[PDB]
Amino acid sequence: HPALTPEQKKELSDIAHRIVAPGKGILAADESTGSIAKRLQSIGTENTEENRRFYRQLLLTADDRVNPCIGGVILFHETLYQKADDGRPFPQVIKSKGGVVGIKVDKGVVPLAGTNGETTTQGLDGLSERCAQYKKDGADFAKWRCVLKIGEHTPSALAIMENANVLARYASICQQNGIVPIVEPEILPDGDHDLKRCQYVTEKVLAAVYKALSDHHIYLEGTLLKPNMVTPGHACTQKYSHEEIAMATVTALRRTVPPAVTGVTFLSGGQSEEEASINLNAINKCPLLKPWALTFSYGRALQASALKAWGGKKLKAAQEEYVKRALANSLACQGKYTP
Amino acid sequence: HPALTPEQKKELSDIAHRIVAPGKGILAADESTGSIAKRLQSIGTENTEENRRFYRQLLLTADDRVNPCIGGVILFHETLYQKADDGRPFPQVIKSKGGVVGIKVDKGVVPLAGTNGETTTQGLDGLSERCAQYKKDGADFAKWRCVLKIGEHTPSALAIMENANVLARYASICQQNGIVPIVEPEILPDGDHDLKRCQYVTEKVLAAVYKALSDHHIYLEGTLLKPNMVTPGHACTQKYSHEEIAMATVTALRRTVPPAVTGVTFLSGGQSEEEASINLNAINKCPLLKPWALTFSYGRALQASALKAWGGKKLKAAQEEYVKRALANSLACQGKYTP
Amino acid sequence: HPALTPEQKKELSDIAHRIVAPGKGILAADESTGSIAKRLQSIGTENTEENRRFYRQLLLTADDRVNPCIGGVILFHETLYQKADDGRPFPQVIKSKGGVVGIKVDKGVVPLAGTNGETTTQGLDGLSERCAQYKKDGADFAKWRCVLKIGEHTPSALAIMENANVLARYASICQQNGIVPIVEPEILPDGDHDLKRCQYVTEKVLAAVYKALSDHHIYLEGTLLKPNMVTPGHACTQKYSHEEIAMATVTALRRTVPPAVTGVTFLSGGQSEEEASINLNAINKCPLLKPWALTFSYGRALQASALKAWGGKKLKAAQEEYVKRALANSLACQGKYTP
Amino acid sequence: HPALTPEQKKELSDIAHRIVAPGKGILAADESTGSIAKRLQSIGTENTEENRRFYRQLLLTADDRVNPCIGGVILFHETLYQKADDGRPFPQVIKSKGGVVGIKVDKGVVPLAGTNGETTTQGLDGLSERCAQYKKDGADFAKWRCVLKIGEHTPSALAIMENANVLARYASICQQNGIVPIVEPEILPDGDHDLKRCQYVTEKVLAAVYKALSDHHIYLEGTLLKPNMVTPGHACTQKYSHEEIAMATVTALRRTVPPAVTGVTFLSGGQSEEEASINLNAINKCPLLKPWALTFSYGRALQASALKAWGGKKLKAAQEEYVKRALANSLACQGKYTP
């Protein structure tokens, strides 16, 4: 009684390899309504459906510059069905530009009882049905975000095991519906934890994640990993260098992530665009053996300059800013980026 | 960082003890739309909302004899807001007859990929919000049905641990919202597994369930257990007597269930009403030490006679039959029942 | 594939019941060579083999009415073959006095790598052969001492799971050789952890212990539990009354320990004779339901007085002191002892 | 509080890299007294130190053309203390020639109670001190053999997790004493299991093994993996090509073994020398990305022809046979071997 047939396995592996093809990354446009409301009010734009649609169309309808740059674009539930002003659907736009359609299938994080500010992620209800719907709607990969806080007694064993179990359930459902699941065990940089503590926490979290994936019979070749870079806390007084951070991140992935994983798509995790790009370039320049596609999956690290150059006015300046950021991060993913 | 405050624990314990009082059991009137349609077509009548309401009136609205025999009555999401033809809502009817309202908070059994027909339960999305709503609507306890099946390799480790984790999440959410969680780790009596194989499977399942409850900081004095009686599969050819079936069940509970659990409300997996009642009588007549209230949580084994004596035509005969069955099950819970 | 046959289970249950018969406790005379050297240099006398034989001489051969007070005595490998100077060996002495022989089968605690002062224990090598030998030598129950310390990040998940695993292996081997295994998850009282922290740690440790016992197919009716009293640290400022200590300890046991366990034989904790006795008396006076034999298993909490009165007396004064202590402790176990 | 300081980590990684330097495998010269008696009686000679030491000297003392062929040699306690014809200790004989000295630190397998013919390896008692002694004696790496059998209900969860726990304990102790631990989760080819079933079982076993290693804070860069080739059972009717065997084995390693592992040193598992060599060559010729040193750790697959050509003549022909077998196996581990 296998989980998937060879046809499903081949399809999932093909989708994952298309997503993490050399030099290709992920554009994280899956900002929920509240997050994008904060992003738009940071520049003064009002959070309306039309403004959201126009901003996401400005992001997605970029040029041949980002054509061989973005392996896949992840959208939201609303963004999947929205149409560009040209009249073409957003998944169709992404596919025409050579990308792969993705969608966040989270329902937000909920508190865990008995632990110090630790949250597990929900969204498993009807996930099979709505993942089949998204697959029919052009989506090929999904995203599940689980956050883990480094604190005095966190990430606790309960939070770690629960998040790993929930991620494995998400991945099982997505692979059963033909959707490539991107497992994101987010570890928040909020805190004073140093690089060594962050590396230890990432190692433990990813170990539990991959044990859960093995337990749930997840086809690892048809999955992607979306972990944060091993970085110090936001309150960390001790400054760690770029190559040191890259070595820590690559080592943490090496000690845990089996090579069957098609590729690793990092996140900015609240760091600046240039810092994220140089960190990814150093990671791909690490003098170790890294048997995955160490590529990027950036949100604000791709959108901050675009939003600043946009400001809400109805375009090509913001598009060019996003294009150059995407090109820089592609060169970082290829190891040939200069800050 | 505790899970519940002393006041929360005290009120949950009060609700639990009010549920499992000496003699008082649980009426499982939480038949979903499909199950109630199947029962109504078994008696031949049409499946309508008014037909369901009339069934619920037939069950809940009764005489003063049912009052000191039924501790709590669990309803459906629909039945929670339905009102009796008199005008009083069903939760207020249940409270007026001395009972306590219950709500089924499941969302079905989604299959587990990679397993031999093993299904995990869903319904955790928005469970906190809807449990707060149910608590405001009069519901003081919930129920979560997890299905495990004794096959040739099942219940597998994945199925057991996943169902235990899901039940623990359900229980944590319910206790956070002030609702007593009835954890029901159903092991289906489908197959030819002998009595002692059923005992072994039940022992493993309950051990995993209570380990998960401990890991999720579940206040066990504020929860109830709803397992099956340790019984052979319907295809088993060895016939085990009532006293030895009771011995097996009580031993299985004694080896896994900690005494903190206020009460064990037993389910009846296809048992006849009389057979389930005599099984409960034997269980409560077991010479071993049972530190829990071994009451009933019967559904079909409580209202099959009601269905037969009702037929669908608009009543008191079915009411009296249900009263007979409820009194028999109360005497069985008190260990003073005879056929 | 049952671990034990019905005859094996019956024998183990008989041994356990004889161990924890009403009012019958345990004397922990299993001090190792170094431990008894320190305990005898506390009075300053000596270490030599014969003079330490003379300790067990007056410990076991003291009165003729300690039979209804102490039911079993844990000895050492050395003490097993040591003889009373009259010619009778100590196992036969304890049998003649109505007791049952026990032997500690540890090999000391060893450090766990990567953690903060957490030590797992050895003794599993050749344990089957030496347990068969001890059964041939009259030993009917064993002992395993796993230590866990409460600190800033302790007991860790690794230490808890490893100690539970080694305890379960010990129990499996002992039950396979017909020896009743006493699982002792010693949670060391050093530190400043409060009562609530101690109770939480004890609950977690016992939950993992009993999950491991279930995983290793441990016959719980043929086992005993030897946990500590739920007591604060040596440096906890808050003063907790005896009945409150008892309520916490009994609640921690009820929340975890399944009723199948024959009895709970508490630890001395390194505390005073009178206060330990009244603590046990309060535990047996707790207004809850305790489905075990909450008896005593004390070392220095029965020895210190008979040590001060002995100091190398070559006798009856220390014999009488230990006898009066054991009588008071049996009275406490029966919930009758008055300080 | 890390398990190892950076100096210890560097030393362990250096030892591992020396062990699996390109083109170098491992000679599994270790044999318990019973196993070596069985071999020497199969060739017809007697089993005393006389022939045992001469056999070990035959194996280790060899031609200079085997120097880049064998990276490490796993020995026994006796063979560690035995000397060669020169009067020189076998550890030193292996050293200064290129080989790293290794010793099996098992104390045999002990049956697990409650399961169907499943065993756990013992040897943890005194492992720290005796590994320190082995380091003093020239040994730089160890070997631990855990046996898992594919059956109707096996490998059970208890057996898998217990073997992983004892392997992780062994590895932590060895890394504490500076010994590089070779984690060997043997899965017996005994049975009729299909190649797919063998791959599934190997996948689960390796996932559990590496989860345990992560839980015990094992430094993966300073460890070696010694798994069997994913091969059918002894009675599997379907014949599988060498390329198919290689693909299955490499896939099973990819899905579970993280890249931090310095190398993978397979075993014959009771197959012929030629079959083992061609299987290793196919594994190293697999068209996948394998971030480990896939080499050989062979016993009979390196010693059977040598022993048959020796027969107790007291030698050059046996030396030549073993040397040519080792040369073929090194060419296979380099991926450049043809019959």
Any idea how long chain A is?
339
* Angstroms from A76 CA to nearest CA on chain D: 31
Q: What is the resolution of this structure in A?
A: 3.1
- Say yes or no for a CB contact (<8 Å) between A214 and D207: yes
Half-sphere exposure of B43 toward its Cβ, with a 13 Å CA cutoff?
Answer: 23
C268 is in an annotated binding site: yes
- Say yes or no for a CB contact (<8 Å) between B290 and C259: yes
D300 is in an annotated binding site: yes
Those chains having 3 or more beta-carbon pairs within 8 angstroms of chain A are B, D
Phi-psi region of A189 (alpha: psi -120 to 50; beta: other; left: phi over 0): alpha
CA dihedral D190, D194, D196, D201 (to 10 degrees): -30
- Say yes or no for a CB contact (<8 Å) between B214 and C203: yes
Q: Which residues in chain A are contacts of B123 at CB distance < 8 A?
A: 125
Three-state secondary structure of chain B: CCCCCHHHHHHHHHHHHHHCCCCCEEEECCCCHHHHHHHHHHHCCCCCHHHHHHHHHHHHCCCCCCCCCEEEEEECHHHHHCECCCCCEHHHHHHHCCCEEEEECCCCEEECCCCCCCEEECCCCCHHHHHHHHHHCCEEEEEEEEEEECCCCCCCHHHHHHHHHHHHHHHHHHHHCCCEEEEEEEEECCCCCCHHHHHHHHHHHHHHHHHHHHHCCCCHHHCEECCECCCCCCCCCCCCCHHHHHHHHHHHHHHHCCCCCCEECEECCCCCHHHHHHHHHHHHCCCCCCCCECCECCCHHHHHHHHHHHCCCCCHHHHHHHHHHHHHHHHHHCCCCCC
Those chains having 3 or more beta-carbon pairs within 8 angstroms of chain C are B, D
Alpha-carbon gap, residue A282 to A240, rounded angstroms: 13
Long-range contacts formed by B78-86: CB under 8 A, 24+ apart: B78/B33, B78/B49, B78/B52, B79/B29, B79/B30, B79/B52, B79/B53, B80/B134, B80/B137, B80/B138, B80/B139, B81/B137, B82/B49, B82/B52, B82/B53, B82/B56, B84/B57, B84/B60, B85/B53, B85/B54, B85/B57, B86/B61
Alpha-carbon gap, residue B130 to B113, rounded angstroms: 28
Option in B207, B258, B290 nearest C214 (CB): B207
Coil, helix or strand at residue A315: coil
Q: Which residues of B are catalytic?
A: 184, 226
Residues 6+ apart with CB under 8 A from B302: B27, B28, B273, B296, B322, B325, B326, B329
Whether residue B155 is preceded by a cis peptide bond, meaning omega within 30 degrees of 0, is: yes
| Chain B residues touching chain C at CB-CB below 8 Å | 203-204, 207-208, 210-211, 214-215, 220-221, 251, 254-260, 289-291
Residues 6+ apart with CB under 8 A from A113: B3, B4, B172, B173, B175, B176, B216, B217
- Say yes or no for a CB contact (<8 Å) between C210 and B208: no
- Say yes or no for a CB contact (<8 Å) between B114 and A2: yes
R_g (Cα) of chain B, nearest Å: 19
Sign of CA dihedral D7, D12, D14, D15: positive
Give the residue from chain C lying closest to B251, CA to CA: C260
C71 is in an annotated binding site: no
Option in D125, D158, D217 nearest C215 (CB): D158
Option in C1, C113, C169 nearest D3 (CB): C113
Q: Which residues in chain C are contacts of B20 at CB distance < 8 A?
A: none
Q: Residue ranges per domain, chain B?
A: 1-339
Alpha-carbon gap, residue D91 to A192, rounded angstroms: 49
Which residue in C283, C203, C258, C270 sits closest to C38, CA to CA?
C270
- Say yes or no for a CB contact (<8 Å) between A125 and B123: yes
Alpha-carbon gap, residue D165 to D163, rounded angstroms: 5
Alpha-carbon gap, residue B48 to B226, rounded angstroms: 29
* Angstroms from B87 CA to nearest CA on chain C: 43
- Say yes or no for a CB contact (<8 Å) between D207 and A207: no
Query: Is residue C289 a contact partner of residue C250, using CB atoms and an 8 Å limit?
Result: no
Q: Which residues in chain D are contacts of C215 at CB distance < 8 A?
A: 157-158, 161
Q: What angle do CA A67, A270, A104 make, to 5 degrees?
A: 55
Please state the φ and ψ torsions of residue A132, each to the nearest 5 degrees.
-60, -40
Three-state secondary structure of B35-73: HHHHHHHHHCCCCCHHHHHHHHHHHHCCCCCCCCCEEEE
- Say yes or no for a CB contact (<8 Å) between C113 and D158: no
DSSP string, A114-126: TSSS-EEE---TT
DSSP state of A107: -
Q: Which residues in chain B are contacts of A120 at CB distance < 8 A?
A: 169
Q: Which residues in chain D are contacts of C165 at CB distance < 8 A?
A: 162, 165
Of these residues, D31, D118, D162, D184, which one is catalytic?
D184
C32 is in an annotated binding site: no
For chain C, strand residue ranges (E) read 25-28, 70-75, 100-104, 109-111, 119-121, 139-149, 180-188, 224-225, 263-266, 293-298
Whether residue D155 is preceded by a cis peptide bond, meaning omega within 30 degrees of 0, is: yes
Six-digit token pair at C182? 């006493």
Coil, helix or strand at residue C76: coil
H or E element, residue C200: helix C195-215
Q: Which residues in chain B are contacts of A115 at CB distance < 8 A?
A: 1, 217
* Angstroms from A33 CA to nearest CA on chain D: 37
Alpha-carbon gap, residue A159 to A242, rounded angstroms: 30
Six-digit token pair at A6? 């060879």
Option in D120, D158, D175 nearest C113 (CB): D175
Inter-CA distances, C321 with C267, C313, C316, C335, D210, Å: 20, 13, 8, 21, 55
